[PDB]
């Protein structure tokens, strides 16, 4: 995974994420949308063949928090939820 900043200014950050696809991109975006301070966020795959592993993101906040902090919060929430689901599954299966 690599982060290539397309453009960064004010409360906007646009970047590629090399080495990823819909699997993690959609989860990250849907986790981000829960944050009340994120005005706009989305992702896209520019071309299904050439850019199959290079999703492009966009994050816009309201100035209360910087985008790279909202991304950290989203990733931390994803990690916590995955850990909780793993614990529940381990308890249930045995």
């Amino acid at each position: 995974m690599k982060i290539e900043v397309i453009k960064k200014e004010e409360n906007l950050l646009e970047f590629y994420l090399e080495g990823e696809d819909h699997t993690f991109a959609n989860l990250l975006v849907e986790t981000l949308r829960e944050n009340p301070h994120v005005k706009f966020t989305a992702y896209t795959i520019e071309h299904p063949i050439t850019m199959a592993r290079k999703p492009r993101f966009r994050v816009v906040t309201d100035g209360e928090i910087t985008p790279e902090e909202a991304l950290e919060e989203a990733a931390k929430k994803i990690f916590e939820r995955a850990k909780e689901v793993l614990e529940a599954w381990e308890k249930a299966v045995k």
């Binding site: 995974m1 699997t23 993690f24 959609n26 989860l27 939820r81 689901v85 529940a88 599954w89 249930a92």
Partner: protein, 258 residues
């Protein structure tokens, strides 16, 4: 909060109910199981003799399609970079008969064909077949030969069948024949859609007004089956650990920007 309840556990499959997560998380889990969980599979074949009626590129594909058991403790299958450990499968056959997957010999006792009754090729009299297959770890997204099974889910829904319908007894009988749980109540019969429930043509008129279906939020019925490469619980745990590892790596790369 998050909880997991298991409905049915067969030998090579498991069907459980996941509760308390968003649709995105369920789709991420499904795609991670389908594409990210690694297994062992044949990659290259070194033929010495092939007098069978099938070409080399067909026997190679048939060998690739065979599922091989994968150890869990020896390797760290949840890492983001996979080992290059290689296991060699050899074979020597001759004479009339059918060459089965059980005739393959492995260097490593932990990795060997799961099903010993898969036919590979029919050798006639005098035809010989000798080769040395090479197996290595790989992910399901690169090639379908590495897929550790098949996974799908569905919404957890309840179908309301009002008793004002003149023939709700037939609907209840059909539902019980299918096998879905049925919870009888006054004025409405409740059907839990463990498996899909398509109402017949005659009752299609009542759809919506009388027969209406509600969706229980954040609840999904998962179905995971494996071909024997890994136990199902190992598959699910490995997928979840892979998701955690990806989240941590993203955190690290994002922090690198500051």
């Amino acid at each position: 909060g998050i909880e997991v309840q298991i409905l049915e556990k067969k030998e090579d499959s498991i069907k459980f109910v996941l509760k308390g997560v968003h649709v995105s998380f369920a789709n991420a889990l499904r795609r991670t199981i389908l594409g990210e969980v690694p297994t062992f599979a044949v990659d290259e074949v070194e033929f010495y003799e092939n007098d069978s009626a099938l070409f080399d590129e067909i026997i190679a594909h048939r060998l690739a399609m065979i599922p091989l058991t994968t150890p869990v403790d020896r390797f760290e299958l949840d890492a983001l970079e996979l080992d290059d450990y290689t296991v060699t499968l050899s074979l020597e056959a001759e004479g009339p008969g059918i060459v089965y997957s059980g005739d393959l010999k492995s260097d490593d006792p932990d990795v060997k064909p799961v099903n010993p009754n898969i036919p590979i090729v029919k050798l006639a009299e005098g035809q010989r077949l000798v080769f040395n297959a090479y197996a290595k770890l790989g992910r399901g997204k690169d090639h379908a030969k590495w897929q550790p099974g098949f996974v799908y889910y569905k919404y957890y829904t309840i179908v309301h069948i009002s008793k004002s319908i003149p023939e709700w007894k037939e609907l209840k009988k059909l539902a019980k024949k299918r096998g879905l749980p049925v919870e009888e109540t006054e004025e409405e019969v409740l059907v839990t859609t463990i498996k899909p429930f398509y109402i017949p043509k005659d009752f299609e008129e009542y759809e919506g007004k009388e027969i209406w279906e509600e969706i229980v939020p954040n609840t999904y019925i998962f179905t995971v089956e494996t071909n024997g490469e890994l136990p199902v619980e190992e598959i699910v745990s490995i997928a979840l650990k892979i998701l955690m590892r990806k989240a941590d790596r993203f955190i690290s790369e994002l922090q690198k920007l500051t």
